[PDB]
Write a protein that binds this ligand. Structure first.
Ligand SMILES: NC(=O)c1nccnc1NCc1ccccc1C(F)(F)F
Ligand SMILES: NC(=O)c1nccnc1NCc1ccccc1C(F)(F)F
Ligand code: PRO
Ligand code: PRO
Ligand SMILES: [Sr+2]
Ligand SMILES: [Sr+2]
Ligand SMILES: [Zn+2]
Ligand SMILES: [Zn+2]
Lengths: 487, 498
């Protein structure tokens, strides 16, 4: 590893995603190859989240990638924001299509015409569908792997309900599942809140979100979104059902949509990665333990070399029995010192070393990836203390990252102390009037980069006392709003 | 119920089964179809089995970009020349025209192999075994048909690079065997292992192996899977090179393979086992293996007793889950039991379980097989054992009827007219073939020329399907092809296909 996180963050980031064998670059700007090491993280996320939403009655499906032009322009506010970043197909080989078709940036306009066909009676609701797929948002801002790419993987869940109390319940339920993905899996603390009128999803009523903080850059980044579309889409796609009471009074469904992307993997790297490679939380770590034989010299006993090789295979059989994910690295054309840095750069939480002097003494060495501690453990307590170190790494990664979040999430009441603490690489919660105009004025003023609205926190730090005005002086403060430079 | 009959009009029957089973919803873009949860669950079942198997082989999952530059796509000359007119091109983002059009992957050889070249610096980096589950686009000239032939479809593509041709060739047959297990052991569909002729092989590879399946209602075969040996045609173009320690200083090119399987699998399953009552799911891939419906709930039964009948249904549900049987308990109060029976018959659930009030105190229940309609009354105590035996027998007899259907419809002919007569009877034929491409086109036109079909069946000529690894009869020495102008090389399976 070359660069350092505190110095050049961008070059440290490009070095660790490639040398951990997560990312490979592509001759199309904004598109990055997910190599198996990275994809396994997305699979661990997918296995967790797929299991949790199917308890809620959501089923998996797959809708088409191509959107017709008529369907795209069905609702005018949704198509207004997404119009510039829609990639259009106009040709099949050398023959031009009669009408251009669009690659989905999101599937609201693809799925809901089918929702209208499937909802004939009251008994056809609720409809709860989810798909794992790729999406294209052609962003001409500078792309960055995982965090902001031209094409990314995600899940998008779309639900339709007869009542508003139903949709309101699911919006918060999905958001809590997104927080578990970041906190219980990726060991990343998040802030749950509500988007402002300026940053809310175009075509919905309100947008709940979770925000994460990247200390190395001082910038915040959105982790997940759970939108309440209300009736905005069902009115344009005619997802109707008869009212059980008044016959002939149409009722529009209440809808939600929610999405989680592979940016999770980038935020994992930017938060936990250090200057000696990736750091994987054990909950999503593809390989939790790697066993590496040590001390094998050219003149070593070939009979004992078989015995030392056998002892490494004895540890993996035991750790597999305790459902600890472990791979034994016995490749005979790589030095034991090369395997050290290889799995270090990859982020494996625990390295297990086996040497002749330790094998004969019924002992082995455990090397934690996060802190670098080396501990000699007897051969009997392998299934216990290694398991204990794994969740200790999980909690050490989380408490140290929450302590970073608590230090950099402070309160400010006027734009004097707001501009000061913002330029120190921290995010602040300021009294906000909620107007889309004052929101742009802050971002224009705080650049003299800028700071956007992140979320209106469900639980802010300080209780807004009556009489406190905004930072604009012309309007009262409606709520404390978390602000900061964002990705 | 179902209106169209599979034996009369197959197209309407297919369109009705895939919709009334809630598998397919249509879209406003031609050739693209919505995979509803009932169909998608099948694909996740195929995905779970095939993924566990290729990982035994050392293959790992990943995801490459769907966009291809024009230069990378055109590196292998004969590869792009075959796919060029069916590649979708992105030419503008919003209202802003792109300086250089980019392409949507019809397959990922040209996307991945620039990275393979970068990853292969020495012989220690080989082999490379990568696979991905993703979507591709093929804007084909043919008539689209849900599952079987769509403009966008879901699939898996595995791409492996080896240092020697022996290592690659072994993988080709290993994977083809897995595809055959997917069809024969999961979908209960018999298949024929063989290799494509020179005309039908993958453009850019050395040879193509394939599993061909047969659809008796249409008399047409369909390709279920391919496992290509690309040889070195791509590594010579993409510079996937290494230095063998035995041959000093000389550039060695990697031997590569690529293999694919698509969501066509679901349409073949539909076409083979479906009947005039709807879909028929093989129990190994059924989203729901057993559905439990409470019957006999009259308006005279008290709320206390009605809660006791639903509690017994849930008890049957919990017992079947403990023995790893995928079970749904349809306890909906807004649908009558008669609608529930037709609902789960159209969707193909292998076993319907009926629990009534008189049956509850009698300590018995009813099981109804979807494949035959046979009703059996089983004792409450022997439920976990009997139902598992029924599910297993359903899977066997589905495959057993399909295998006998294949046996009777796959015969051998040695003259051009006897091949013709058997071809127009709704069968596929193994004939002695000279192998050359120009003779296969002759067969394609001549069989379509001298075709005697029923009033309504359109003109369709026979094409190559595969050169079977184990043909029906040994080719006689000196035996000549069905054209009579060239010596025959092997028995080739011919017939009309999708
Ligand atoms: N080009 C991009 O914006 C992007 N690129 C790569 C990965 N994620 C991206 N967006 C984030 C996103 C998009 C859609 C729904 C939720 C989220 C969330 F992560 F913020 F929650
Ligand atoms: N547009 C199409 O050709 C198509 N559309 C939908 C589904 N499968 C399709 N082709 C079959 C196919 C393509 C690529 C690799 C293998 C196979 C196989 F299934 F035959 F093995
Ligand atoms: O793009 C979004 O944010 C919403 C949630 C996923 C589907 N559409
Ligand atoms: O399309 C094909 O047939 C090969 C195998 C999968 C990738 N390319
Ligand atoms: Sr062609
Ligand atoms: Sr040389
Ligand atoms: Zn203000
Ligand atoms: Zn011939």
């Amino acid at each position: 590893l070359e660069a350092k996180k505190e110095e050049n963050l961008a070059d440290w980031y490009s070095q660790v995603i490639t040398k951990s064998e997560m990312i490979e670059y592509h001759d199309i700007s904004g598109c990055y190859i997910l190599r198996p090491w990275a994809y396994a993280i997305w699979e661990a996320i997918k296995d967790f989240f797929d299991a949790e939403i199917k308890k809620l009655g959501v089923e998996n499906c797959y809708f088409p990638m191509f959107v017709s032009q008529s369907a795209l322009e069905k609702e005018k506010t949704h198509v207004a924001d997404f119009a510039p970043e829609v990639a259009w197909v106009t040709r099949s080989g050398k023959t031009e299509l009669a009408e251009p078709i669009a690659i989905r940036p999101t599937s609201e306009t693809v799925m809901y015409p089918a929702y209208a066909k499937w909802v004939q009676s009251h008994r056809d609701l609720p409809i709860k569908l989810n798909q794992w797929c790729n999406v294209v948002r052609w962003e001409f801002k500078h792309p960055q792997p995982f965090l902001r790419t031209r094409e990314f993987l995600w899940q998008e869940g779309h639900s339709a309900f007869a009542t508003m109390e139903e949709a309101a319940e699911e919006v918060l339920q999905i958001l809590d599942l997104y927080a578990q993905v970041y906190e219980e899996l990726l060991a990343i603390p998040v802030v749950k809140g509500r988007k402002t009128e300026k940053e809310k999803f175009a075509g919905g009523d309100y947008t709940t979100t979770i925000e994460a903080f990247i200390s190395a850059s001082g910038r915040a980044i959105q982790g997940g979104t759970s939108h309440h579309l209300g009736q905005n889409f069902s009115k344009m796609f005619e997802i109707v059902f008869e009212d059980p009471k008044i016959p002939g009074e149409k009722q529009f469904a209440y809808q939600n949509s929610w999405g989680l992307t592979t940016r999770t993997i980038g935020v994992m790297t930017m938060v936990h990665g250090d200057n000696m490679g990736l750091v994987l939380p054990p909950r999503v770590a593809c390989v939790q333990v790697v066993i590496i034989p040590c001390g094998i010299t050219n003149a070593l006993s070939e009979e004992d070399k078989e015995a030392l090789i056998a002892k490494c295979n004895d540890y993996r059989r035991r750790l597999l029995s305790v459902n600890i994910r472990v791979r034994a690295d016995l490749r005979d054309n790589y030095s034991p010192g090369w395997k050290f840095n290889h799995w270090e750069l990859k982020g494996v939480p625990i390295r297990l070393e086996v040497g002749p002097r330790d094998m004969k003494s019924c002992q082995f060495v455990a090397v934690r990836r996060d802190t670098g501690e080396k501990l000699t453990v007897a051969e009997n307590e392998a299934e216990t203390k290694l398991q204990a170190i794994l969740e200790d790494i999980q909690v050490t990664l989380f408490t140290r990252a929450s302590e970073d979040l608590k230090t950099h999430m402070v309160v400010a009441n006027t734009m004097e102390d707001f501009q000061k603490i913002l330029d120190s690489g921290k995010i602040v919660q300021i009294p906000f009037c909620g107007e889309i105009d004052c929101e742009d004025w802050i971002k224009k003023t705080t650049a003299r980069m800028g700071a956007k609205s992140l979320c209106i926190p469900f639980k802010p730090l300080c209780e807004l006392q009556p009489g406190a005005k905004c930072v604009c002086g012309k309007n009262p403060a409606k709520y404390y709003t978390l602000f900061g430079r964002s990705y």
